[PDB]
Design an enzyme around this catalytic site. Structure first.
Site, PDB file in Angstrom:
ATOM      1  N   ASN A   1       0.812  -1.214   0.000  1.00 56.35           N
ATOM      2  CA  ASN A   1       0.000   0.000   0.000  1.00 56.35           C
ATOM      3  C   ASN A   1       0.850   1.271   0.000  1.00 56.35           C
ATOM      4  O   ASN A   1       0.850   2.026  -0.977  1.00 56.35           O
ATOM      5  CB  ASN A   1      -0.968  -0.027   1.198  1.00 56.35           C
ATOM      6  CG  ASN A   1      -1.875   1.195   1.272  1.00 56.35           C
ATOM      7  OD1 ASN A   1      -2.028   1.942   0.306  1.00 56.35           O
ATOM      8  ND2 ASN A   1      -2.488   1.399   2.435  1.00 56.35           N
TER       9      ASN A   1
ATOM     10  N   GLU B   1      -0.129  11.642  -3.702  1.00 57.55           N
ATOM     11  CA  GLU B   1       0.536  11.318  -2.439  1.00 57.55           C
ATOM     12  C   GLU B   1       2.059  11.421  -2.511  1.00 57.55           C
ATOM     13  O   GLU B   1       2.782  10.420  -2.433  1.00 57.55           O
ATOM     14  CB  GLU B   1       0.094   9.948  -1.933  1.00 57.55           C
ATOM     15  CG  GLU B   1      -1.370   9.899  -1.572  1.00 57.55           C
ATOM     16  CD  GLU B   1      -1.887   8.493  -1.457  1.00 57.55           C
ATOM     17  OE1 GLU B   1      -1.708   7.722  -2.424  1.00 57.55           O
ATOM     18  OE2 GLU B   1      -2.480   8.164  -0.404  1.00 57.55           O
TER      19      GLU B   1
ATOM     20  N   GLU C   1     -10.291  11.581  -4.300  1.00 60.72           N
ATOM     21  CA  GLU C   1     -10.667  10.270  -3.771  1.00 60.72           C
ATOM     22  C   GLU C   1     -11.727  10.401  -2.673  1.00 60.72           C
ATOM     23  O   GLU C   1     -11.581  11.215  -1.754  1.00 60.72           O
ATOM     24  CB  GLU C   1      -9.440   9.541  -3.222  1.00 60.72           C
ATOM     25  CG  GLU C   1      -8.519   8.971  -4.289  1.00 60.72           C
ATOM     26  CD  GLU C   1      -7.162   8.571  -3.753  1.00 60.72           C
ATOM     27  OE1 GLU C   1      -7.092   7.980  -2.653  1.00 60.72           O
ATOM     28  OE2 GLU C   1      -6.159   8.840  -4.446  1.00 60.72           O
TER      29      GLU C   1
ATOM     30  N   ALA D   1     -15.357   7.913  -0.734  1.00 60.69           N
ATOM     31  CA  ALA D   1     -16.182   6.696  -0.623  1.00 60.69           C
ATOM     32  C   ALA D   1     -15.403   5.408  -0.906  1.00 60.69           C
ATOM     33  O   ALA D   1     -15.582   4.778  -1.953  1.00 60.69           O
ATOM     34  CB  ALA D   1     -17.423   6.791  -1.516  1.00 60.69           C
TER      35      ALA D   1
ATOM     36  N   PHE E   1      -6.237  -5.019   1.013  1.00 62.45           N
ATOM     37  CA  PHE E   1      -6.368  -3.584   0.732  1.00 62.45           C
ATOM     38  C   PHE E   1      -6.248  -3.209  -0.750  1.00 62.45           C
ATOM     39  O   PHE E   1      -6.493  -2.058  -1.127  1.00 62.45           O
ATOM     40  CB  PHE E   1      -5.395  -2.759   1.585  1.00 62.45           C
ATOM     41  CG  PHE E   1      -5.992  -2.259   2.869  1.00 62.45           C
ATOM     42  CD1 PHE E   1      -6.767  -1.103   2.885  1.00 62.45           C
ATOM     43  CD2 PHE E   1      -5.785  -2.943   4.063  1.00 62.45           C
ATOM     44  CE1 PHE E   1      -7.328  -0.635   4.072  1.00 62.45           C
ATOM     45  CE2 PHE E   1      -6.341  -2.485   5.254  1.00 62.45           C
ATOM     46  CZ  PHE E   1      -7.114  -1.328   5.259  1.00 62.45           C
TER      47      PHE E   1
HETATM   48 NA    NA Z   1      -6.343   0.553  -1.769  1.00 64.02          NA
END
Ligand code: NA
Ligand SMILES: [Mg+2]
Ligand SMILES: [Mg+2]
Ligand SMILES: [Mg+2]
Ligand SMILES: [Mg+2]
Ligand SMILES: [Mg+2]
Ligand code: NA
Ligand code: NA
Ligand code: NA
Lengths: 1011, 204
Positions: free
Chosen positions: A90, A449, A525, A527, A589
């Protein structure tokens, strides 16, 4: 040299970026966009060899094919052929964080290809090779001679091969490295793969060529006039005889044409660009482009001699549209957009990160079928064909640079570093140079990010200077920095502040009106659609609509990133993080999609569809007000079906044609409905139907719906006087009730109904018991794990409070014989380590008809974390084929995610009442149910339920859906009350307070009888 | 009130009375009330109320019980929100505690008389010999709901014989964003369709 460990070397001998080229030599083929003889595909079978390190690659492979090598399909990811393990991580980098260094053990893919080149290509002009996608870095040799090097896994790398190629047989040698300094800017939340995963092609260009062309459209105030401005650039010998003709086509009709020689206007003291020209074409009353109506023109760019010798022709689809931010609003063609968007990763369960037309089309059909109008290229430039499709079908695209440095500490360590500016700029510039001509692209993004660094500022400015047509956005470093034109937070809640130091996520409503702030807000981004999620979705869309400067968002995300694996029997199953021996991994994830890997819909997809509707409705008496949220189009392929039904039974229905202007309204007057005699609730249901097929949908498609309660007749008539009176038999262990062929048994030690008889057959495998817990959803668990417990997460709060292992102490269990019935009264206390959590008081009334009226009243302690559910469960011995209910349906729905559900008589096979989430959890609930039929049984009341072959224990004990074994009988869960599912994010408590079971005292009543 | 059902049963240690009532106007059933009364060996009367409300009827002002007691006691003692008058959408100032006030303080002299004197979140109420237990809202005064709605000025009110008691499971918000249009917020409207509350009446 070790160029893959140097952020100063991002390529060697690579050619300049440009929009899509085909080098046509016939102008009609350019216009029609038909295939080009000068553009060859080198896709197909290649020879591949895997190595542990670049050092391990044998020197002979440059001159000669290896015998150990295997024949593989290209494009591909070499992980998908099983050469090494795909890694899912992740945030944390798949390598040791030591920029710019990568492991000495670097999986090396040696691709090669023996191919043919026509004499004609080598006798004149320029022959180049285009590598659309190579992950992450590669060296290229041709016929044994070194050509160059290149980085950035998501944009074409191009090299001139004229001086390398000979007539007939030639051989390529592409050494691809899995890790490089490039990987440091490629830290997206996805599978870490490698190889030649996009198209390979050979393009022949004339020596005197079109080297670049920019297309722009600007408009008068009311958009009834436009000037198309095309800037064309050339390479080779500049001569007086050269011209450019830009012609503009609408199907077969040429609407504009312009012809000029080379030599642009005076730019500065040294003159102008003699190798350039700008063509300006006037276009009256132009057909506009939008996701609503994707009107396109065709612009042909001819480089030619004045006397009429076409040297070469390039071309593109043009969409006349204008994007600007004015007075805090994002405008397309003067109208404020409402972004119904989704984040889309390039993912295939079988092929990994190789994209194909079929798949890309399937995604766009499905997206548009579910009322999406936008897509975010998370988090890289996409396959070239994607932008073309969005141009044609109609989707607003956010095109995003391939810069993600999420696992840096702090997040902007590289992006604040001026030594990392060269590498970053190419990921931004070469993106813009490639895609700037696409009408579908409306917003540029600087990556994702990577915090906020000075490199983000420099690059933001660069795009503003180069391309005034499109707003630049970027989320890092607070989502409202100097690097973005749009406030674009990720997972900011509607009303709740999440005020982290330095980078707070304010309530989106609150954010807009902060002192001095003016810009529009569209979440990059929101929900998080992980597992059983999308609860609280309607809250977003109520806000988006109420607030002008809230212009929507991009759901995270489109498809589950699960990969196909095979078992001992050769049976396929969906796999996630860790299933390929990959470690460290962030488990499941990678699966946060509205659709499964195979593009089968999650139940959340229908919730998105209902909320993102383009028609709003209100009710007032007999008049339905239909309001259009379309900005440009009329409701020219729409009618309205309406249905009035008394608790499932159709009463009246009709069709009315929809004739609504964009932003307009239509008052549809319903015919006077004759009201029925029998008791019940009348339900109006309207559906917007498209009678005609489209490029994206089939005839009869349903784009919108809505429901209302109309008149209600409460039943005042009582059942008839009972034909008998049920008998009680008392033992120390049991109370037993008998009537006709029906029999009930209550265990006096436990205090539960432990068995039931219809005729002479058993009805239970597990006694009817209270249940206050659920198999935890992904939102229940958050980031918590066995090794690393997050105590704040719901599942841990329930665990620690003792909810899952609390045992029922019996307080009361009595039987009383009434005048027409038997009455069983019980009381239970649930306790853990000397703490009373729940008390459940029940009465069971069984009269001479054969009906059992259960009355439950539950007390929950205030200092115990709110329970997942408040209901009952049992394991029925019966296994029926169908489930029939009067309640919200047809699909799975939960309290905070039930707006898409409609109340009606639904009838489904058992298997549909289970949602096969790859990570098993509480699933398949249907809310607001008033009557449930399963085999011989009927339950009546006002409850929520799920019914399947899998127990809540089995569900919470199993990590993958394929390991689930159907249990004996059928597990039935009937709750009076169920907690919300949440999903504003999937790493912290996200269930809204109003959907938490916190009243302290709860009541529900069920009638159990044989139908 | 139209009676639908009225039964009596004998339990091992209690008498059980079950009742059903419908409220009709012009052939329309507005409210259905289903009750049980459980008088046990302790002398305590457990009343359980289950009410249906027609979905196409305007949401009710209250759902409770009322009666006129013969008693006129000097003090009113309760365990719940107070000490002052509080309503569902106006109960933040009030504190959950034990309160004791003279009866007149349980009435609020609004010049234009209306529903008044209510306290919410009350678990126990004491008046003379009587005790009521559960989770309810209450007012208690010498003025009926009928006298209050028919009287225009506070000074024109006469104390009625005995004491009027209103115990609600559920009371609608009072609102006030303005006073010329409906201003009771949705979350404070009695719109759930099916309402349950349980009371214990006993002596002390
Ligand atoms: Na994800
Ligand atoms: Mg390098
Ligand atoms: Mg021509
Ligand atoms: Mg891990
Ligand atoms: Mg609605
Ligand atoms: Mg307070
Ligand atoms: Na809006
Ligand atoms: Na599980
Ligand atoms: Na009055």
């Amino acid at each position: 040299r070790r160029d893959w460990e140097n952020p100063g070397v991002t390529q060697l001998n690579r050619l300049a970026a440009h929009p899509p080229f085909a080098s046509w030599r016939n102008s009609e083929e350019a216009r029609t966009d038909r295939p080009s003889q000068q553009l060859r595909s080198l896709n197909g079978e290649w020879r591949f060899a895997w190595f542990p390190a670049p050092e391990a690659v044998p020197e002979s492979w440059l001159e000669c094919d290896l015998p150990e090598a295997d024949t593989v399909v290209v494009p591909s990811n070499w992980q998908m052929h099983g050469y090494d393990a795909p890694i899912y991580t992740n945030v944390t980098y798949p390598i040791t964080v030591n920029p710019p260094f990568v492991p000495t053990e670097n999986p090396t893919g040696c691709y090669s290809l023996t191919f043919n080149v026509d004499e004609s290509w080598l006798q004149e002009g320029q022959t180049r090779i285009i590598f659309d996608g190579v992950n992450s870095a590669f060296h290229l040799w041709c016929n044994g001679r070194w050509v160059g090097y290149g980085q950035d896994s998501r944009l074409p790398s191009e090299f001139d091969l004229s001086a390398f190629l000979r007539a007939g047989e030639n051989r390529l040698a592409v050494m691809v490295l899995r890790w490089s300094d490039g990987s440091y800017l490629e830290d997206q939340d996805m599978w870490r793969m490698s190889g030649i995963f996009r198209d390979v092609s050979l393009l022949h260009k004339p020596t005197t060529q079109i080297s670049d062309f920019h297309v722009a459209t600007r408009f008068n105030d009311d958009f009834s006039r436009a000037v198309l401005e095309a800037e064309v650039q050339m390479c080779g010998e500049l001569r007086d005889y050269l011209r450019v003709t830009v012609s503009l086509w609408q199907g077969e009709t040429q609407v504009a044409s312009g012809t000029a020689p080379f030599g642009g206007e005076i730019i500065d003291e040294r003159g102008g660009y003699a190798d350039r020209v700008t063509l300006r074409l006037n276009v009256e009353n132009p057909k506009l482009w939008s996701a609503e109506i994707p009107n396109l023109y065709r612009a042909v760019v001819e480089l030619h001699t004045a006397d009429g010798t076409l040297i070469e022709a390039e071309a593109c689809d043009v969409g006349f549209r204008e994007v600007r931010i004015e007075n805090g609003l994002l405008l397309l063609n003067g109208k404020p957009l409402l972004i119904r968007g989704v984040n889309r990763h390039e993912h295939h369960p079988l092929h990994g990160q190789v994209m194909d037309e079929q798949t890309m089309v399937q995604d766009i059909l499905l997206m548009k079928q579910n009322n999406f109008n936008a897509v975010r290229c998370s988090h890289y430039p996409n396959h070239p064909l994607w932008y073309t499709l969005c141009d044609r079908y109609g989707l607003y695209v956010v095109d995003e640079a391939n810069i993600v440095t999420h696992g840096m500490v702090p997040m902007n360590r590289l992006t604040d570093d001026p030594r990392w500016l060269p590498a970053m700029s190419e990921r931004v510039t070469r993106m813009v140079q490639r895609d700037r001509n696409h009408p579908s692209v409306i917003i540029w993004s600087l990556g994702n990010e990577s915090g906020h660094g000075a490199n983000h500022d420099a690059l933001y400015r660069w795009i503003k200077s180069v391309d005034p047509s499109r707003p630049v956005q970027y989320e890092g470093g607070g989502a409202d920095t100097t690097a973005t034109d749009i406030i674009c937070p990720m997972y900011a809640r509607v009303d709740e502040d999440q005020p982290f130091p330095a980078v707070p996520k304010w309530s989106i409503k609150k954010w807009l009106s902060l002192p001095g702030e003016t810009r529009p807000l569209i979440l990059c981004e929101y929900a998080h659609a992980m597992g059983n999620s999308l609860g609280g979705f309607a809250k977003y869309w109520q806000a988006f609509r109420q607030y002008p400067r809230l212009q929507g968002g991009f759901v995270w995300d489109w498809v589950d990133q699960s990969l196909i694996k095979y078992d001992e029997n050769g049976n396929p199953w969906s796999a996630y993080g860790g299933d390929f021996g990959d470690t460290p991994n962030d488990r499941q994830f990678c699966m946060n999609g509205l659709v499964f890997a195979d593009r089968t819909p999650h139940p959340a997809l229908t919730e998105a569809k209902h909320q993102q509707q383009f028609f709003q409705f209100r009710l007032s008496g007999q008049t339905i007000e239909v309001t259009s949220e379309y900005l440009f189009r009329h409701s020219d392929n729409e009618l309205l079906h309406w249905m009035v039904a008394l608790d499932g039974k159709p009463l009246a229905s009709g069709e009315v044609p929809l004739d609504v202007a964009p932003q307009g309204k239509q008052l549809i007057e319903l015919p006077e409905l004759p009201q029925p005699e029998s008791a019940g609730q009348l339900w109006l249901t309207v559906r917007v139907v498209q009678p005609n097929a489209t490029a994206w949908s089939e005839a009869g498609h349903i784009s919108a719906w809505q429901q209302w309660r109309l008149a209600e007749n409460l039943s005042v008539t009582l059942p008839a006087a009972s034909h008998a009176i049920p008998h009680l038999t008392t033992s120390e262990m049991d109370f037993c009730i008998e009537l006709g062929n029906k029999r009930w048994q209550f265990n006096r030690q436990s205090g539960f109904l432990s068995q039931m008889w219809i005729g002479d057959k058993k009805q239970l495998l597990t006694p009817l018991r209270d249940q206050f817990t659920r198999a935890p959803l992904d939102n229940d668990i958050g980031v918590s794990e066995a090794t690393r417990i997050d105590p704040n997460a719901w599942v841990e709060r329930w665990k620690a409070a003792g909810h899952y292992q609390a045992e029922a102490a019996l307080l009361q269990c009595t039987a009383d014989t009434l005048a027409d019935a038997v009455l069983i009264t019980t009381a239970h206390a649930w306790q853990h380590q000397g703490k009373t959590l729940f008390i459940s008081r029940k009465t069971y009334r069984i009269d001479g008809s054969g009906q059992m009226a259960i009355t439950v009243d539950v007390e929950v302690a205030s200092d115990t974390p709110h329970p997942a559910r408040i209901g009952l469960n049992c394991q029925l011995a019966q296994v029926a084929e169908r489930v029939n209910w009067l309640g919200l349906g047809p699909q799975e729905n939960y309290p905070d995610r039930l707006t898409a559900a409609c109340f009606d008589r639904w009838d489904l096979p058992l298997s549909d009442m289970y949602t096969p989430y790859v990570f098993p959890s509480e699933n398949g609930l249907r809310c607001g149910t008033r009557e449930l039929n399963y085999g011989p049984h009927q339950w009546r009341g006002d409850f929520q339920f799920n019914i399947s072959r899998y127990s809540q224990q089995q569900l919470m004990e199993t990590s993958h859906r394929h390991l689930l074994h159907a249990e004996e009988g059928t597990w039935l869960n009937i709750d009076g009350f169920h907690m919300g599912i949440g999903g504003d994010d999937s790493w912290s408590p996200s269930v809204s307070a109003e959907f938490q079971l916190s009243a302290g005292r709860y009541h529900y009543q069920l009638v159990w009888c044989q139908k």
